[PDB]
């Protein structure tokens, strides 16, 4: 079949969109007349000399903004700001209409946004600079739809989702072909957890433009992850890597996480698990050879090194991630969780419980941190406090499928005794969740269910005990066999009771 | 090991929030949208010549509903004869 790459959609497009759009050489006419100068951006282009030459020859503003775009691609944000500022000082823009000045103000707005994205710091200052530039652009020329797009992005960054949605509604009323409006709307809906609507918007953006930056296929893979169709997510991520082989390490990170999930939930045997896990580790290491300071990769590797009893290096990586990425609360919660897990081996119950509490306060979505907090409460013999905390968590999260939480609730209620019906409900839910997940059901839950049903229904208790015995197989103990024999004795099954006693 | 099993069940669900860096949209990223002031309109009208047919088959497979039938005609007003 036809190869799926960037060259495919290049050949689909006309040669005007193939060669001209990716030119690294800029043609600049001179003020003397027909004379022109061609400067290749592959070489080290000086910002000051190029700006002085452009100002002297008074070239068209398109060349200035194109050079600014190329220096953005080079990462020279300060150089691009210098280009924009000296362009505002140039004679051409001063003698042009306010539309050109508004476009360059919007370019400075995008420069502030790119600096904020590339640094993830000084958010308030860059946001104020971008807001002032966008306000100046809107005052000079309010008819530009790019000003509305910038207003919507500014609202989205400040979490003013309603106003940005209204702006994108106005843009859609103006024209339905705006790809950036669709991408911004999908970003807002994804932020509002409207995954399906953002998925249709991502599909529309992909159909309109398969070569649009940012990549819609990342959002399509995220939506497929939300809809459990992770195979199509991995396929779309591979296609994205084919289209964008550079500066797209996040796609490789998502592919590695999906591979880890597939290894965890699909490995049919220990050897296959070992092979898939080692392949995931090798792929993660290969991705690490490009960037060795990415905090998420260190957090992922911390799990493997914790499983390797390398607690010291886990502590070092966690402290490094805390020092670098203290702004992100999820990394703080994960680092606190791993520190609590490390201290659990040391049995620092107070310290581990405090770390779990800090992880919970940092990110409330970390269910594992709260379950570890409950486990630490059990460790400090705080049975009542753990029970109250578990009841609060269950009542707040009745839809959460935390099977181990329900198993622990059933065991605690069986120890209490008076709450036996809640124990029955939680153990039945645990059994159902384990059956749906195709995970080995713990026979201890069946033993607890039989003990509870002893005072309610001997038949159900005997059936659960038989199921537990079948699960154990050769691991049957004297207590289980004796209780089976007594059950058959009460059932007047003399032969079966005699066999179980034997 | 119970917490290890819980970690295996949860995996990296809540760690995908930071991975939303690709959702951010910036005008300067596209190479050919800026080369002329009206290059945005030129690129918007460059893909009207393309359609679903021009899409790669694997990317067409990615378009999954969350074939035409011969007996559903599109309505007309003048007919023929």
């Amino acid at each position: 079949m036809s190869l799926l790459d960037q060259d495919y959609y290049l050949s689909a497009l006309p040669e005007d969109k193939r060669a001209e759009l990716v030119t690294l050489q800029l043609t600049i006419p001179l003020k003397s007349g027909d004379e022109v100068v061609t400067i290749d951006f592959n070489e080290d282009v000086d910002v000051s000399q190029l700006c002085v030459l452009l100002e002297s020859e008074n070239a068209r503003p398109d060349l200035w903004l194109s050079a600014a775009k190329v220096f953005v691609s080079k990462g020279n944000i300060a150089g691009s700001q210098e280009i924009i500022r000296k362009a505002l000082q140039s004679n051409v823009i001063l003698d042009s209409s306010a539309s050109v000045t508004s476009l360059f103000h919007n370019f400075s707005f995008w420069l502030s946004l790119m600096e904020y994205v590339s640094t993830n710091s000084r958010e308030d200052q860059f946001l104020e600079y971008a807001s002032n530039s966008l306000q100046a652009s809107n005052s000079l020329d309010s008819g530009l739809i790019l000003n509305g797009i910038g207003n919507g992005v500014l609202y989205a960054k400040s979490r003013r989702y309603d106003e940005a949605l209204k702006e994108f509604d106005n843009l859609l009323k103006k024209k339905s072909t705006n790809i950036l409006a669709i991408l911004g709307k999908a970003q807002i809906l994804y932020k509002r957890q409207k995954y399906s609507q953002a998925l249709e918007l991502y599909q529309k953006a992909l159909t309109i433009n398969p070569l649009i930056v940012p990549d819609p296929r990342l959002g399509i893979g995220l939506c497929f992850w939300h809809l459990n169709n992770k195979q199509l997510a991995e396929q779309a991520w591979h296609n994205s890597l084919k289209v964008h082989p550079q500066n797209n390490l996040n796609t490789k990170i998502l592919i590695c996480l999906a591979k880890f999930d597939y290894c965890f939930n699909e490995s049919k045997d220990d050897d296959e698990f070992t092979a898939l896990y080692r392949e995931s580790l090798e792929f993660l290491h290969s991705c690490l050879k490009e960037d060795a300071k990415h905090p998420l990769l260190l957090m992922v590797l911390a799990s493997y090194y914790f499983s390797k009893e390398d607690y010291e290096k886990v502590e070092k990586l966690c402290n490094l991630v805390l020092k670098e990425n203290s702004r992100n609360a999820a990394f703080v919660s994960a680092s606190h969780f791993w520190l609590a897990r490390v201290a659990y081996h040391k049995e620092d119950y107070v310290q581990a419980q405090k770390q779990f509490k800090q992880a919970e306060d940092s990110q409330n979505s970390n269910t594992l941190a709260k379950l570890g907090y409950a486990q630490c409460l059990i460790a400090r013999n705080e049975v009542g406090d753990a029970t109250i905390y578990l009841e609060k968590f269950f009542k707040e999260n009745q839809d959460s499928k935390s099977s181990e939480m329900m198993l622990l609730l059933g065991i605690i209620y069986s120890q209490s005794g008076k709450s036996y019906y809640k124990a029955i409900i939680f153990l039945e839910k645990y059994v159902a969740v384990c059956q749906e997940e195709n995970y080995p059901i713990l026979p201890e839950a069946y033993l607890v269910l039989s003990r509870v049903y002893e005072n309610k229904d001997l038949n159900v208790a005997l059936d659960y005990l038989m199921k537990a015995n079948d699960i154990l197989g050769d691991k049957a103990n004297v207590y289980v066999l004796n209780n089976l024999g007594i059950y058959h004795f009460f059932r007047n099954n003399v032969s079966q009771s005699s066999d179980f006693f034997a | 090991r119970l917490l290890s099993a819980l970690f295996s069940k949860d995996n990296f669900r809540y760690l995908m929030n930071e991975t939303s860096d690709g959702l951010d949209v910036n005008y300067l990223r596209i190479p050919g949208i800026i080369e002329n002031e009206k290059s945005l309109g030129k690129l918007f009208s460059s893909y009207k010549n393309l359609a679903i047919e021009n899409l790669h088959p694997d990317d067409r497979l990615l378009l999954v509903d969350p074939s035409p039938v011969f007996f559903l005609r599109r309505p007309q007003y003048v007919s023929d004869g």
């Binding site: 490995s267 698990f273 580790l281 060795a292 590797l301 195709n438 995970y439 | 099993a5």
Partner: peptide, 30 residues
């Protein structure tokens, strides 16, 4: 038989022991 075959040590809780049997060297800065 795939339902019973998938039930193994890592599902039973020996996941840490299985990972401990997998040795690999990384280029760690720390």
């Amino acid at each position: 038989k795939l339902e019973s075959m998938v039930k193994s040590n890592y599902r039973n809780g020996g996941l840490d022991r299985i990972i401990s049997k997998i040795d690999f060297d990384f280029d760690l800065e720390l």
